[PDB]
Design a protein around this ligand. Sequence first.
Ligand SMILES: c1ccc(Cc2ccc(OC[C@H]3CCCN3)cc2)cc1
Ligand SMILES: [Yb+3]
Ligand SMILES: [Yb+3]
Ligand SMILES: [Zn+2]
Length: 606
Amino acid sequence: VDTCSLASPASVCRTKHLHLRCSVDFTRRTLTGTAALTVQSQEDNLRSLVLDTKDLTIEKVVINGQEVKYALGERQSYKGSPMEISLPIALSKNQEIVIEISFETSPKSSALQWLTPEQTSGKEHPYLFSQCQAIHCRAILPCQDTPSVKLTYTAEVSVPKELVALMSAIRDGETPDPEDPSRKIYKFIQKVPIPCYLIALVVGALESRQIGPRTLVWSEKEQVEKSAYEFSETESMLKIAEDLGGPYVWGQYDLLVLPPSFPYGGMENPCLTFVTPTLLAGDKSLSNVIAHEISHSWTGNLVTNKTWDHFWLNEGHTVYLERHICGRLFGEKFRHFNALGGWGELQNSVKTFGETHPFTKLVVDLTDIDPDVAYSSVPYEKGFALLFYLEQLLGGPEIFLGFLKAYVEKFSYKSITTDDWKDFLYSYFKDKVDVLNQVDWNAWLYSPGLPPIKPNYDMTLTNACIALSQRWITAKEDDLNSFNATDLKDLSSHQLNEFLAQTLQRAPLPLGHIKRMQEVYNFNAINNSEIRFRWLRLCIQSKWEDAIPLALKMATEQGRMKFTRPLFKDLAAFDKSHDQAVRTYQEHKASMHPVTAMLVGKDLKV
Ligand SMILES: c1ccc(Cc2ccc(OC[C@H]3CCCN3)cc2)cc1
Ligand SMILES: [Yb+3]
Ligand SMILES: [Yb+3]
Ligand SMILES: [Zn+2]
């Protein structure tokens, strides 16, 4: 059972389909309409069921054409309020009925960010986007808000006629709205069963450009050309992913480039991946995020974690596939470079939480924990590290990719636990059980801290990064003259980033060192978001007051939490910028994404 959901579990009843009919009201910042849930009883004599809700106003519940009794329980913090519905006729096992709930969202919906025209590229029209993962779908519509249940869906969405609606589904046409000529209705169909966290909606002044046989990129007009170029490797990556994972079942693979406040690098919404505009580096160098989102089309969207305690199944396997895609495109030495960088990020995460912290376990226990507070690189990188270690134990990448494909095929359209995964690993590799039994399963799956063993990494591309980082760390004042722009001449953007990551792991450095780094490398000029993030962190941690306005600007001009949270935290930790950091958060809080505002507030103790 799912300790993050208040709804009836899958063992009691299962939602098979959602038909959503709604209207997006920008004047009120509300979504209003009806959610018709087709529900299948899993029990004899079923007379009631419970759904998740969060800050929803319920008008009525209709079954068999008549209003029925319901009750909203008390709010249980971030979990929201349970909604018990009294069924008019007792159901037999496997009987299906349709329950139509009339509802309206709150402007404060934690699933939604409502943007004013000023907050968009075009400055004329407003914009709305959703982000349900993990447990925010209940803040859009009443549902069994657990990934243990998979449903198909159809939707009709009425929007102001100058705007476009898109969803995690196949577009099924548009018409003027008969109830309001100032509006358009956009229709959508998702015929593959999905967990509700994958329900997504965007409304805005959107344009599209074709970039491959099954891919359009969508954004505001101002970003279309740059996005088409940035993500032009998409089809090549989809082809490799199909080779590794099996058939792509979702029809199209479109991309949507969101406004800068989108809180994450990407979200693998089926048919329509959402990405941060912080990927728009100009040189395709941050395309691994696209590889990651593509990979979720198998690991996550087809094979799904049964509860959020098992989130590493989604992420570890996706990072594993991501790094294989990038290895195929750019070589095995590059895969190792990225794998080793990932271990570095895991080191950082473990150090941040502390080596005994429960959020550093691979399988977590989210009982009475807000999923958004637990979120970190751990499931990604500790999960990847386990799979990479197993690859090395079991005879290499060709062999292990055989397992991955078989795993996806075995559990397609299902929701599974860590034990399901482990049982299948043992089944697939039955002739290697002696090797499998050498793994310290209790440590890897259930213990906090760094894994009990570190995999073997090729160091070829990393060596120059470490060498230069070490030169800086061990430099004394009289060595600073020796550094020069030529030091960087043979380093790729990825290597510059890794040099900064290595150096940040030892921060602070002396202020004069950091001043010299700017003098000779001109890192202030680099617009690549990953590099700029790490550089500004290094500058702030090393107490360079000149970097304060730069870091405040980056923290607020975009909202990807990977960057915004640590920049604010670093600015708060620096005495010279502390008061400004707090004031800046206070001033921006009302117009921030609701989850980002919550987490930055928590980080700052404000
Ligand atoms: C370990 C850490 C967090 C969680 C809960 C969780 C899972 C996914 C989440 O997704 C949020 C963003 C990540 C990228 C797009 N969605 C958030 C919280 C479970 C295990
Ligand atoms: Yb159609
Ligand atoms: Yb010296
Ligand atoms: Zn992911």
